[model samples]
Target: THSAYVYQLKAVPDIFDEISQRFPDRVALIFDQRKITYRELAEQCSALAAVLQNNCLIKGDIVAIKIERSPELYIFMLALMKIGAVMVPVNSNSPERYIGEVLSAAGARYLISDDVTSVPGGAWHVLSSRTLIQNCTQQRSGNYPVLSADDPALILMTSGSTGKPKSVLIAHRGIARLGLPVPALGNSERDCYLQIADISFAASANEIWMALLTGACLTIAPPGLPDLMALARQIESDNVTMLFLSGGLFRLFVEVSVETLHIPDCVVVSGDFVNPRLFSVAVQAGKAKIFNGLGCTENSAISSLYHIQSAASPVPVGTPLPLVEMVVFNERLQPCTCGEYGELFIAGAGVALGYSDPQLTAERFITIPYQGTDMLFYRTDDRATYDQDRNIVLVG
Candidate 1:
């Protein structure tokens, strides 16, 4: 009900459907020399959703997608959303132990992957993308489960870099926020985003939904992670205009002396500490608008972003994006004054529904009164303070 955001909270698939209808012939996904238009992609998703519905899946059933990042991966993502099946995205290279635990812990019954031999022995069944697409070629309509804004859609496991593996169950509202952009972050139907982030990473959700939700084009790289200069090659080769990179990848872009034209219209660096000097150099050398993105997995990849035009030793994470609210709190759970160091807490549309484990959810997600109204806030464990301009500055 808040008017601060231009976008209303809705299911992710609903927004995509509207965009697909408007730009039915626009290029939606580029795979090698093959390009799929919005209408074709939407039709394919519907077909696959019907097949999945008629065969094994039902609303809210956890389906783990452990395939490589390709056209098939995007197909599976959209198809699952269309049918209202809860998706648990798993890395293709995930260890047998991790995969097994995810299957058991998340109660994921259907594991969709091409490689049936690599996965650990389990009660789950593996569905092949090759056969899945073929099965839905001519087949058609089915009744799909209606989805609500708060319905749980994804079961995401945070990486080890963050902490011990924690399962974040995100609702449709959590992901629906990504497609709507705040201008300088490449919010155009003509923009093209190159898929770089792994399926398990929160950025992958952003990469897919950011393009799909806005009627933009998504470029599928050959396959696997890119090498140091491989990203630049892919960007220029595909004429990608939008990107979200990790701090490590940005370093590579800088070290390789990437040309100005190869850089995207908007570039975001996160997932590690931002080097202000490096940021300054990149901004000055390239035409790209650089930014420092800050958030935890519980906030669906981004809560705040700082547009870097000039340099400071410790760069501020700028301001909260649309539909996001930020507050700093002390150990006593009381609010901190301006310029006072405290723990960062996030409250808004991007916040996940909760953790898969109820105990973990109860410990991290807390509700407290904010300005006379009760609001749910996600504990971010990040030390921060507000600058003179109220930009969030992360500290040790």
Candidate 2:
């Protein structure tokens, strides 16, 4: 039923606007000593949308945003969505060459930066983050661009391991799809989410949109809080009920503060090998439900999740999420039998629109006949096998 609902969902900005109207005074974001209600956030985003519209940004226009981690970053992103513009968030620590390459590849119409002095000159229009927010009028813009669910919402660059980073275009429908499985996390309006990942990474979408859509409060960690003890302390003080972290970061946190770690109600780990020894610590902590998710930038955050409870050693990656289908195939492209190893392929709503380069897109994203119907699938280079219980077991 959740999957069915997401199939007809509207653009992300419309969903967020509805939520803000329903819970106007509810606290939406908490950054250090600063807190903003849902109504306040909607107001700020509306004002910023007006600024972008006045500057000639319209639906489908790509805007490159490079700024340090702050509440303002979220506002800029949502504002861009409000005006139906696509956002390409560049990591603040990226080299100038890499930044230039991404901007050129995306053919960005505008660039927003916090440190304008540091950014190299380019043909694209440049604007200051502080100046835009400070000068924008806090009035809702009328006659805003009408956006469809299929409109492009974000352009996330890959980690560039294979070669130069490739831009992955995610539609508003894909962003809204993340909220379809909110019940899996036992999320509620009372929950406070802690966001530690950088905005440039696709995983950060889980931290930002999930809370906003579900009426939960989102708390952003201030920049440079790298120590595990500091993160644990922030969780305790903020009373964060939901969290997501990379497996390596989770392992480091457990190693540093397992005995004193503050356990939240739900935690999902992804991005690297999950250490069972450290995972057991989370199970022993009591009250927190831990999930191991497998996905990539091209799959729109995470496609499947494994709930870690009283399972035996070498945990299985569990079942696919709602509306997502996973299959394992041998080198010849035939399905693998149980207990056989093969590369993993994912299909269904979670698949991306494909990479910026047509050749790369054709190579990775393919169409196949399955269950008497044609479907698009993403070729994940991950190796996996099915256990006797039908759970996917990661080989690497």
Candidate 3:
């Protein structure tokens, strides 16, 4: 006889205080050539928050971050999250007009940009990346009010079918999941992590937040590192323990240098589907534990994970971890039995509050009765199902 197991999902919290409490002096960030420890990281956030408040930013306001992946970008992210402000990271590749439209839509009051010498734009405030870090040191109270878990943490933009930009809103509670056990799959502080994705993508959030929350050392790919060759060298030179690779880049690496490249200890792939043939090559060539995760901008960067036990032809997306609920349903909202394909819906602490656009939010988020209360479920258009082992298999 066995006791019944009661599942209780803890509501995720604002991670700033927790991170600051856990590792105050361990290295918190590394980019280009600069490094910041957790002690400095927290203090920088405090100073940046003070600067924002001094510039008249208030809780619930949105701030646009128009810069590439740098130490400053990470600092800005932590700073905004600390003070209940929303971060909208603009794509450096996107034209100025597009960036302006995003800022306008998000109602961004302040724009934190890189050195004005490189990126050209006008905003409420313009400061060099150097000054931003300096501002983090100035004596100021950083007296912003505390933020609730459900408050907006960041806004990510995707290209709509009509070519206009569509924004997805994420809550602090949703991203808090990344700071928990789910990320433990990618190893720990014992290993250095390689960050090689574009800053605009949500996958970058995993790299940024993992370091911020876990005291993991993140090494930025040097400028003009030829994809496969440079990545291998970086792993060896930096003693990289883990990596988060976009499917496209991962495929290229596999295709070009599977036999030649040095594989890190643990590898994680996200964004799009991994090519099966190339994935198998990667598995055979390296001692690394390869994983693939599913998430979108609205879900705060993780939905499900696939950890390959052995090299397989096709890999299922694996199971949802704690703090996440996955359900399959057909039309009429009826449950789809195991092995049958249907639309995948996710509901739980990780499901963010709907988009700022009320109409879009209402259309995408619906109430489900599994728990007897009104829970917002994000309807993912991708097709999937549960397999014999209860893993979520991608059908589409």
Q: lDDT tens digits, residues 259-283, model 1?
A: 6334678887877687677887888
TM-score of 3: 0.87
TM-score, ranked from best to worst:
1, 2, 3
List the candidate 2 regions with Cα displacement exceeding 4 Å: 1-4, 159-164, 259-262, 311-314
Q: For residues 1-396, could you state the per-residue lDDT of candidate 2 as single tens digits?
A: 122445577778888888898889989998887999999998998888888788788888889999776889889989899889889888777788888888888888889999898775687788899898887785766679778777888899885445666889987876777666555676777888888887788888888887887678898887754667667777888788888888767887677765433468788888867778778887787667888877688877766778887747367777877677888877887778999999888887668888888998999898888777687888887888888878887787
By lDDT rank, best first, the candidates go 2, 1, 3
TM-score of 1: 0.94
| Candidate 3: segments with Cα more than 4 A from true spot | 1-14, 117-129, 136-140, 159-165, 183-186, 223-227, 259-262, 311-314, 371-374
Q: Give model 2's TM-score versus the native structure.
A: 0.93
How big is the positional error of residue 78 in model 2, measured in Å on the Cα after superposition?
0.6
For all candidates in order, the CA lDDT equals 0.80, 0.80, 0.69
- Report lDDT (Cα) of residue 127, candidate 3: 49
The candidate scoring highest on TM-score is 1
User: Once model 1 is optimally superposed onto the true structure by TM-score, how far is the C-alpha of residue 163 displaced, in angstroms?
Assistant: 3.1
Clashes of each: 0, 0, 1
